[PDB]
Design a protein around this ligand. Structure first.
Ligand SMILES: Nc1ccn([C@@H]2O[C@H](COP(=O)(O)OP(=O)(O)O)[C@@H](O)[C@H]2O)c(=O)n1
Ligand SMILES: Nc1ccn([C@@H]2O[C@H](COP(=O)(O)OP(=O)(O)O)[C@@H](O)[C@H]2O)c(=O)n1
Ligand SMILES: [Mg+2]
Lengths: 663, 665
């Protein structure tokens, strides 16, 4: 009665069974389970939940108090009046949706500073399986929050009013500092629709004005309607008329960044960023994503100061060490300098011994000068038009929009008043290319620093003079106490640190794989703990209990992979979270990671940023994680339930031989 | 902000959009629509539904009257007492689920003779777009129904108690009449699990006793638990113990077939068929489906009597005519005879003129003798063991089970009494291999018929003598009036028939593509209309209006492809239905046909039975359908809404050139 094969029927059956949680629960009941090493229970279920709730309650009160503080005026910004709501229609609807972001015909926004913090689930697990005092102390220092009005304005003022230093910079110099492979550059002489369709972005991010919807929601309006209109005014050299008639098409929104913040500085520090119109960001992203994909990193070309694109897995961690060891004596041979946005790793030798410095810039975007920004854009544009000269003029026009977006877009903050940064200097954080602008500004300053070493100014190795130098000569503010050269353990033993310092937020450690040294990332337990108990997620009451339980599992898998497996205490905690995850939650069909489970939040595991788990019901063993970082002696990801496939299929193959003798 | 490309974002958006009927309806609002040829509306919505309800009401009352008829006794069967409910456990549960098919510990069933018929939607369309009197009369003749107790027992008695003639048949004769390709036989000397996982069946069919669930539900119980138990007793030559301990494992169920039945004979005719245990049918299916996949058909080998596997598309229809024309003068050269189950196409020449016969066998399964059945099994088993001798003993044992299933399975009918056919003769309809057993029995009889022509008995060309011959010499009953030779139009012009007769339920017709003849299937309007107004589905209250409207759309496509597009009137009716289908229903994401829309009901378009529409939102135009039947590659299926995709995506590409000179230097 041919309709489908039994093989196919069995598969269909199994795919449907992973969606029946009641059935999974039954079928996995006595299943053999592989248990992670885990910390012992420290208190009972109710106590863990009460301790977490007490902490959350205190943080909520701290946020509410800080949110109640008056903020300073916005008088440090230029004020431009009000913008009319865009009236452009795309078929049956306006591109600016009716009855939203509209105050009597004028574009409007409202800043959200909510009282709610992150959820208690992760913190409950922490109290359940770790030291009460340490958990409590750790959890009280940081919280995931909207921040505050006062802190928002304070930080906005700092990065829009700082006195900058114009860099001395040319194509020739940027070529030396940021070599790239021209063959990897996108053919921007291709047709524009196709180029823009190739850029990647966050589907649920704001599309900005005039759309006031997510990017995936606003994507047809942008592509089908606004983009060709923008294109027509570009090529007719008539952007002025478009700007004047439809100012919302060039308007940005200045927003408070919801983030992990130190509780004690909530009233002084909330980070601003800018959200630009989708058509502008997507157009410019054609150049910016093409360039970043073509950039060499330091470990590939030792003349390069670029670490933007560096990642830890597949030898990456060890690549850093090998590259760094080539650092020479200060004043004689080149140091090793790695820039990624506002993060830097500096190596030099004094009397033969390797030293490492990992300084912080204070609010770096405030120090990014207009000359650097224009030179970066010129560098990126010229790289493409050198390789693809027939599209030179179009992309040079795009370059001008890019500079504008990075330095001078008008923006809303709260209500209808439109603002503009008083000076071209200062980078408008969140503009496309933010990372590259930061990276370049950092490298230019540090390249000059290295030049001064060779000039014989060795006192620039010392915090006092280094800080003065970066301030007076580059307008950069290095945080006092963060210029602290440390002796490098150049060939660490098993379990030993490279140094105690962080780069890209992680320490470098050596661990054992058989008799091989494997270089891996690492953190102190307290830092894993802070991340764990402050998930970047607000309390969603639409979230089922199953979803919450599955989130804990995925986040634990994520932290382990990021290197929490290499700290006993974090390993034991993530292990307890995983072991306490129900069989049906482990094995259910999940949506994130394309059915493979939510990828780790940490962004620099792989260069393309996309880490994917092999299976949604695997757990990160030490052996498996180690193999992710080695250049390789790989292995599969171990399943939590080795027999899950057949318990779920209700079928275990028995060999039945048709060739038997019966007689 | 890297997460996914705008291109992938677009695509994801558009897959979402096709599931949002409100949005599809709005976006397709004033879209350009390509219309199929249609018959014009003949009455309003309300008028159509009213007349449809009128007919439906009359059918239900006719069905209820026929179902109230007392049925004759089942004394004609052997009675075997009652069977104990199977207690075999598969892990955490019994393979025979608790509280089902269990009367005080004995296996039980209840026959369903429900009063409801098919739904009225399609009939409403018929009334909306066609002649009132003709639609009413057509729709009253036939109804989709469970049948009756009275008709069911009457047809069961006929099928189980007929005097059969034992065929004279050897492997040599079957090799002649049923050649096959030995290299196309599955390697049955491979591991059994893999063999069984390769057979194909209907996921929602009953798995039979002891499962009492659908085959997809019962599948792990069958595969993981019962099958190896069966295997083990087979190889230990110990089936007797298994049978005696667990008799539900060999029990069948005798069922009434829900089908299209003639109203006036409802009380005398309801087809029985048998539902065997899943482990049994699956095991035997390894041989049976391997063999049917290896068989040659008539048009591949002119010695072959076999049409089992013939299909109409891709030149099939013309292959039949090409094969048929080779028929020679009766008594001097061989006829052309094609058998498919109980369906037969016969050609011979008389004074050089080609003639065609298309007779009907009455209740053929009652005439299939045990000798024929054992010869077919032996033939199929031998075919495999000659090619794969290392598994000879296992499969000969399966062959014994197969014969038992085909002739002697004990079975339930209604309640707990277990029955069995008294004589071995008579085929238990629905057993795996039913079609082949039927095909071989018929072929053996027509082969003998042909020889008698060659021996000089030319009076066997006439119904009176033919009917007598098939009765007396083969135990087969040819329906009076259906043996009527017809002059074949050997090379029909455009729009002309081959003859008016049917084979596999369809006529053969020639139509024009450009200026070439293409051979196609065809029916008169009335036969299409009968099929249209009697869908093979019950009234389910679970079904939404969207689902019902879509079904109409899909069934109209199905009939067009089957050949209704080649009859102007039926074409017009299907087109009217298709054109009156709402844009959102036409364009929505559909689950059937793997997303391309429910395939046609008709089972012999392709040899594998599977036909797949290219797209779910296209319609079957004359040009597209005619290309399915010619050997030329099928042209595109035309979209109902050529701009649906760009309209749904809300995006139409514009070329924007990056190489423009913006400023003269
Ligand atoms: N009705 C439900 C309930 C839970 N879930 C699962 O809940 C999980 C969400 O938790 P997660 O750890 O992966 O990620 P986030 O919720 O932290 O973003 C997904 O894997 C979903 O498959 C679901 O998909 N549908
Ligand atoms: N809620 C709904 C609505 C429509 N449908 C569609 O209704 C169609 C019914 O099949 P058919 O009668 O056209 O063959 C299927 O293609 C379904 O995808 C559905 O499945 N579910
Ligand atoms: Mg366009």
């Amino acid at each position: 009665p041919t309709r489908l094969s039994l093989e196919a029927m069995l598969a269909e059956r199994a795919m449907v069974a992973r969606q029946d949680l009641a059935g999974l629960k039954r079928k996995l009941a006595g299943a053999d389970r592989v248990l992670a090493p885990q910390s012992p229970e420290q208190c009972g279920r109710e106590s863990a939940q009460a301790q977490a709730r007490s902490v959350t309650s205190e943080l909520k009160s701290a946020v509410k108090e800080a949110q109640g503080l008056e903020h300073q005026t916005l008088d440090f910004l230029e004020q431009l009046g009000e913008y009319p709501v865009c009236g452009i229609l795309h078929g049956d609807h306006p591109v600016h949706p009716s009855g939203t972001h509209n105050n009597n015909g004028k574009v409007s926004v409202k800043r959200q500073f909510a009282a709610g913090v992150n959820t208690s689930d992760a913190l409950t697990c922490a109290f359940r399986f770790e030291d009460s005092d340490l958990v409590r102390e750790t959890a009280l220092k940081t919280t995931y929050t909207d921040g505050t009005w006062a802190g928002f304005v304070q930080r906005l003022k700092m990065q829009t009013t700082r006195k900058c230093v114009q860099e001395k910079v040319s194509r020739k110099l940027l070529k030396q500092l940021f070599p790239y492979d021209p063959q990897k550059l996108v053919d921007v002489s291709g047709e524009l629709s196709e180029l823009v369709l190739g850029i990647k972005t966050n589907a649920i991010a704001s599309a900005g004005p005039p759309y006031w919807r997510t990017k995936r929601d606003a994507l047809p309006d942008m592509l089908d309607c606004v983009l060709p209109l923008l294109y027509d005014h570009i090529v007719r050299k008539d952007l002025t008329t478009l700007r004047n008639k439809h100012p919302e098409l060039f308007l940005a929104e200045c927003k408070n960044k919801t983030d992990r913040y130190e509780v004690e500085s909530l009233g002084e520090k909330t980070r601003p960023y800018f959200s630009h119109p989708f058509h502008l960001s997507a157009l410019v992203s054609v150049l910016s994503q093409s360039f970043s994909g073509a950039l060499k990193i330091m470990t590939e070309d030792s003349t390069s100061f670029n670490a933007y694109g560096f990642s830890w897995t597949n030898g990456g961690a060890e690549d850093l060490a090998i590259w760094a060891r080539q650092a020479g004596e200060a004043g004689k041979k080149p140091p090793r300098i790695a820039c990624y946005g506002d993060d830097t790793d500096i190596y030099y030798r004094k009397d033969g011994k390797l030293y490492r410095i990992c300084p912080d810039f204070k609010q770096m975007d405030g120090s990014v000068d207009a000359t650097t920004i224009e030179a970066v854009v010129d560098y990126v544009v010229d790289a493409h038009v050198k390789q693809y000269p027939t599209a030179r003029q179009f992309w040079e026009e795009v370059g001008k929009l890019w500079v504008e977006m990075a330095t001078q877009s008008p923006f809303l903050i709260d209500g209808t008043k439109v603002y503009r940064k008083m000076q071209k200097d200062g980078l408008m954080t969140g503009v496309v290319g933010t990372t590259l602008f930061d990276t370049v500004k950092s490298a230019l300053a540090y390249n000059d620093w290295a030049d001064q070493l060779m000039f014989g100014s060795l006192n620039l190795l010392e915090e006092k003079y280094a800080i003065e130098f970066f301030k007076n000569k580059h307008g950069l503010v290095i945080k006092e106490g963060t210029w602290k050269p440390a002796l490098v353990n150049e060939d660490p033993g098993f379990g030993e640190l490279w140094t105690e310092q962080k780069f890209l937020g992680l320490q470098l450690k050596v661990v054992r794989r058989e008799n091989e040294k494997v270089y891996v990332p690492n953190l102190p337990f307290e830092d894993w703990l802070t991340m764990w108990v402050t998930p970047r997620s607000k309390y969603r009451s639409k979230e089922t209990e199953t979803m919450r339980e599955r989130t804990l599992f995925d986040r634990a898998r994520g932290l382990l992979v990021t290197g929490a497996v290499f700290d006993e205490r974090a390993r034991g905690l993530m292990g307890a979270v995983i072991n306490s995850t129900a069989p049906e939650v482990v094995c259910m069909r999940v949506q994130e990671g394309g059915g493979r489970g939510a990828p780790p939040a940490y962004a620099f595991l792989t260069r393309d940023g996309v880490f994917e788990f092999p299976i949604s019901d695997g757990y990160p063993s030490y052996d498996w994680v180690v193999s992710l970082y080695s250049r390789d002696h790989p292995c599969d990801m171990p399943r939590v339930f080795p027999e899950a496939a057949t318990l779920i299929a209700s079928y275990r193959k028995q060999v039945m031989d048709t060739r038997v003798v019966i007689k």
